[PDB]
Amino acid sequence: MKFNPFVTSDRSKNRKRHFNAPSHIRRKIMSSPLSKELRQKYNVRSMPIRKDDEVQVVRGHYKGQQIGKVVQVYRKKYVIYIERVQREKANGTTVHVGIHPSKVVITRLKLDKDRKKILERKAKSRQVGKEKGK
Amino acid sequence: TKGTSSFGKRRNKTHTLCRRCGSKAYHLQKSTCGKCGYPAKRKRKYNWSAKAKRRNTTGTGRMRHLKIVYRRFRHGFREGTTPKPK
Amino acid sequence: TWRRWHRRVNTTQKRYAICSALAASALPALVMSKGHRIEEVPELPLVVEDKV
Amino acid sequence: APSRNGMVLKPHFHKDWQRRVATWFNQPARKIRRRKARQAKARRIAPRPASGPIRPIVRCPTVRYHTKVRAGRGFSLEELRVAGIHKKVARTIGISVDPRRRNKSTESLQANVQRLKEYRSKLILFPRKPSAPKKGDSSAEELKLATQLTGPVMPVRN
Amino acid sequence: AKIKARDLRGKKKEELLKQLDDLKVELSQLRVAKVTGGAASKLSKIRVVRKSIARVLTVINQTQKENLRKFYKGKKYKPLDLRPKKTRAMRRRLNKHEENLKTKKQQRKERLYPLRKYAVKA
Amino acid sequence: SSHKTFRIKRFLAKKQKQNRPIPQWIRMKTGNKIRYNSKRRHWRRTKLGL
Amino acid sequence: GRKRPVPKGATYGKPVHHGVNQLKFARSLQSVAEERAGRHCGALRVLNSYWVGEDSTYKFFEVILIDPFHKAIRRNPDTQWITKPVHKHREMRGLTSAGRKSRGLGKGHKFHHTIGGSRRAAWRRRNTLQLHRYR
RNA sequence: CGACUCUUAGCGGUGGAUCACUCGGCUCGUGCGUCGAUGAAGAACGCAGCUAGCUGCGAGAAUUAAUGUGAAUUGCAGGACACAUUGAUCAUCGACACUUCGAACGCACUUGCGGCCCCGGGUUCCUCCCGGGGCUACGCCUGUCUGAGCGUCGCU
RNA sequence: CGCCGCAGGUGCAGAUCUUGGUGGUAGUAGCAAAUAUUCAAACGAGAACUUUGAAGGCCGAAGUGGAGAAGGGUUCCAUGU
RNA sequence: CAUCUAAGGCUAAAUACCGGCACGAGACCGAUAGUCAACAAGUACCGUAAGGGAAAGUUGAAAAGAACUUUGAAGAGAGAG
RNA sequence: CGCGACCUCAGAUCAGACGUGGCGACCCGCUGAAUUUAAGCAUAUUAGUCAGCGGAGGAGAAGAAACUAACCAGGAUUCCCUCAGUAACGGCGAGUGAACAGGGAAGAGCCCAGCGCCGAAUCCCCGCCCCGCGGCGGGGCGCGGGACAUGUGGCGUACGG
Ligand SMILES: [Mg+2]
Ligand SMILES: [Mg+2]
Ligand SMILES: [Mg+2]
Ligand SMILES: [Mg+2]
Ligand SMILES: [Mg+2]
Ligand SMILES: [Mg+2]
Ligand SMILES: [Mg+2]
Ligand SMILES: [Mg+2]
Ligand SMILES: [Mg+2]
Ligand SMILES: [Mg+2]
Ligand SMILES: [Mg+2]
Ligand SMILES: [Mg+2]
Ligand SMILES: [Mg+2]
Ligand SMILES: [Mg+2]
Ligand SMILES: [Mg+2]
Ligand SMILES: [Mg+2]
Ligand SMILES: [Mg+2]
Ligand SMILES: [Mg+2]
Ligand SMILES: [Mg+2]
Ligand SMILES: [Mg+2]
Ligand SMILES: [Mg+2]
Ligand SMILES: [Mg+2]
Ligand SMILES: [Mg+2]
Ligand SMILES: [Mg+2]
Ligand SMILES: [Mg+2]
Ligand SMILES: [Mg+2]
Ligand SMILES: [Mg+2]
Ligand SMILES: [Mg+2]
Ligand SMILES: [Mg+2]
Ligand SMILES: [Mg+2]
Ligand SMILES: [Mg+2]
Ligand SMILES: [Mg+2]
Ligand SMILES: [Zn+2]
After folding, report:
1. Please, which residues have CB within 8 angstroms of residue E84's CB and are 6 or more apart in sequence?
2. Contact A102, A43 (CB under 8 A)
3. Which residues are CB-neighbours of F37 under 8 A, at least 6 positions away?
4. What Å value separates CA E65 and C1' K154?
5. How far, in Å, CA of D90 to CA of D95, rounded?
6. After which residues is chain D broken (C to N over 2.5 A)?
7. CA distance, residue C8 to nearest chain G CA (Å)
8. Do residues A38 and A109 make contact, with C-beta atoms less than 8 angstroms apart?
9. Residue A33 Cα, ligand 30 centroid: separation in angstroms?
10. What pairing do the DSSP bridges indicate for beta strands G129-131 and D21-23?
11. Which of B20, D43, D158, E45 has the lowest CB atom count within 10 Å?
């Protein structure tokens, strides 16, 4: 369990930090698992969700193998919007349904120089831990 | 008559706004604030009213300078320095 | 806050309670009455080698 | 009002005692803080005794305690004089010195100078410059034989 | 089409002031369009131009201040804003030199009787 | 009165400007919790401090 | 001495406090002189003072002041102590020789009132109820 | 027969108890232990495209720069942003900036009025007008300059 | 939540108790100081009360008139509901 | 006889800490409780002033916050969703 | 009957500095009640407390004996345990009330004036050059100013020198 005297385990303090988190650490909170194929190709498990990467919904009403491109990362409401994950409201217009990124699986990563830099950063640390415990 | 009739005659203000502390306690005829005692150099403050003290103590306002002091203390009040350019 | 939260117990009585607790932890009836599922345990003063 | 047999009690609680109450909830934290400071000090003075300077043998004053011997504030100037130790060099080599204490008798005076001679013989003096040992101590006596003494230096026993 | 601080820094005072003037006439035009209806595009450019004016003025004031620091470097007396602003109490403290200088009596005591490093055997 | 100082007139100006309803788009903000301006002041109901 | 400053000598209370005249200030006149010099010269540190003369109605003292920010004081040890912030307005806290004489400080049986540093230091220690964790 | 009244139950109202929840307190402990004439605390007035409060900020005004981060902010709109001839946002914050009162400092204030020195314009240097900038508080230390005294003296 | 222990800010009908809510009273008292209204029309879903017109009255220049000081602070003025 | 050497000065540590900055915890309270303040709270409001000083938490997983038809001038309904 | 030296004073928007005000839980200096208890009440108590005023710091104050003791003597200050609800005070009523020794936390010592000696050996300021800017120092120079014999610095302080 936790032994750090400067890290809190208080429920009120943790919920306060979660719901009042600045958007640059809301990015890390809103991470998603990678698929088994991506988790093999890159030696990483999780990844912060991004505006242009493709996910599957694995929990809830919109479960399935349909690959949807993320269209909006609404960090204020801790949800993401995906292409076909939507419903008609009363007047007949479509509205996106917000889904927590922890309930999706990233299948294709929107790649740029920063994403590859983070991906190799996470992989190198994992390899260091593997060879430390080897 | 001391009741309703006498209330009609009051139309001259005893107090006005105070250029220090901004309260409507500046006695015009005495030229003294009844809350801060403005023409006196020292702020009017009494320990028999702890409730009045916490209404106007440090922290109830903006702390434009003290907020920066509390931040700068954490790095030893460093000056004349810049983060290393990228 | 000055409610006397703490109690002091005699060292001889605290030593006594340890002796009673150790002695009771050597009897299968008392340990099972705590509910410790010692049914296939080979011996109840269960001692293992130092390699542990 | 008194009731039957009892003791005439006079509590001293007529003086607004509740505004001055010292609780001791910081006692375990104070013991930790003192212990940490003791450990930090011992690390600071690396081979020197962790307790501090050596204190003299002292007889307790009154007729209740004159059969008892404890540790005093510092060695008197007459004791250092006949032990051959300068009163300003003594403090630098870990000997406490009390310039205001006199010696009324020769038994206590001679017992403290035997104490100083024994300490001076037990003392390992590191050279001021480790490369050049001038008059301090042989390198064999300080290579590994120098450890931090714990507890009072030569504790006073009855 | 924007302005950045980094590429403003090589410019000279005249062309920095000219760029400040052009942003100021555009901001006044935007405030005109605000009170005459205008468009959402013109209304949203108000903040962009306002930040641009702040950007130019920050670079102007930084360049001027850094030149004045260089000019007064090594001089005995400096303007108060160029002096360090640590804390009123920290500015009243003894400086590093006089905090550490000793009397001759103290110097002899340290020279004659330095604290020795010693150990005591059990 | 008609005769007023500049400080009094400026104080009355700020009191006038903040005596307006909340914008309607405030009510659509995330985690709003604000229904209406509770600091509305009517000239006849509540008199100003000065 | 110190006349009690009450209107018309009325000290509304029990007879033991009816005194108006024959009352005495707890600090000496020399200490009052140092306080008046220090308050006027708030930028200087009072060091000591001495007696230079008196008549029926006046006492005269001469107070030694030090400018803490003069270089002849800053650059000299053995007088750098007066420049430390803990030594500003010594005369107003009874830290001068005249001011300290009225505090009852001393060593031995005659000065048990001030063990702990002051009378209030002694009073607090003697009037605080020590409630340990284990009673 | 109805009405009315009473009792009980079903349902519906009125009301907001109970229970469950908790980004709040209270208590204890720890480590630091830092304001101000280089203008504090406090107050006033302003500042957002749509903004009243709260919050943030000071005419560079819901923020500039720098650094870290690395694609958002979001209620709506608008518009950027090759993320490499560098970057949204957030955080940090060491550069810069920081209106008016206020110890508050030219004098004074429930108003207002000076003086001195430079710069620019009408002048087209001479001092009038307009604008801009810098000064102009009290106490006090060291030194400086200018002085006063039928104070003590010296030379004439 | 039960059982074995432990610890309480541990049990309400009252305190002209505290806070909140709700009855009967009760569709009751009342909406009675300063003479007074009426006809037609318009707008409007709707008119004793609004507007216009026509009458009959009142203030009667120490006014129920026209303007100010203090105080108020936008109540001023249009448009709409 | 003993004991010190006044009327000048400095000095860390152990000690204190219901204000401040930043943390951790609890056999505490759980929206009439706990801070007055869980919320635009020293706010609204009251007093000439010194000063006094509240009430006020909860849709839902997601606004998916009831399109459309119908009566009514609307509030408000009946269907539908 | 002018010019100087000094002394004692004055002015300046003179050159360079410093103080003011806030917070105030803890700390230092003063001032300082009454409710209350005494089953009344005046001394006493509350209490050197509340309120009032002033001054600080990260701690403050205190502090190296004009001490304790009476011993086979201890040895600055501060804090804890104990002494001790004791010695003592008190309408000897109600009530109040320490210290020494002992055990611990910590532990650290010193500096002037004076008496003397040393060609004032001393210090501040302003210029110039150099090394550096960081809490502005060093080094050198100035028949450059001032302070200072109405006493600066070195030695030295009761433990003697
Ligand atoms: Mg009356
Ligand atoms: Mg009047
Ligand atoms: Mg000397
Ligand atoms: Mg009215
Ligand atoms: Mg009495
Ligand atoms: Mg019901
Ligand atoms: Mg930036
Ligand atoms: Mg006037
Ligand atoms: Mg003369
Ligand atoms: Mg109860
Ligand atoms: Mg009840
Ligand atoms: Mg009726
Ligand atoms: Mg009627
Ligand atoms: Mg008539
Ligand atoms: Mg009229
Ligand atoms: Mg109107
Ligand atoms: Mg509450
Ligand atoms: Mg409830
Ligand atoms: Mg209606
Ligand atoms: Mg000047
Ligand atoms: Mg009585
Ligand atoms: Mg009674
Ligand atoms: Mg009575
Ligand atoms: Mg007080
Ligand atoms: Mg102060
Ligand atoms: Mg001190
Ligand atoms: Mg002292
Ligand atoms: Mg001595
Ligand atoms: Mg006993
Ligand atoms: Mg007493
Ligand atoms: Mg110890
Ligand atoms: Mg001398
Ligand atoms: Zn005021």
Report:
1. B79, B80, E91
2. no
3. F20, F21, F22
4. 49
5. 5
6. none
7. 6
8. yes
9. 75
10. parallel
11. D158
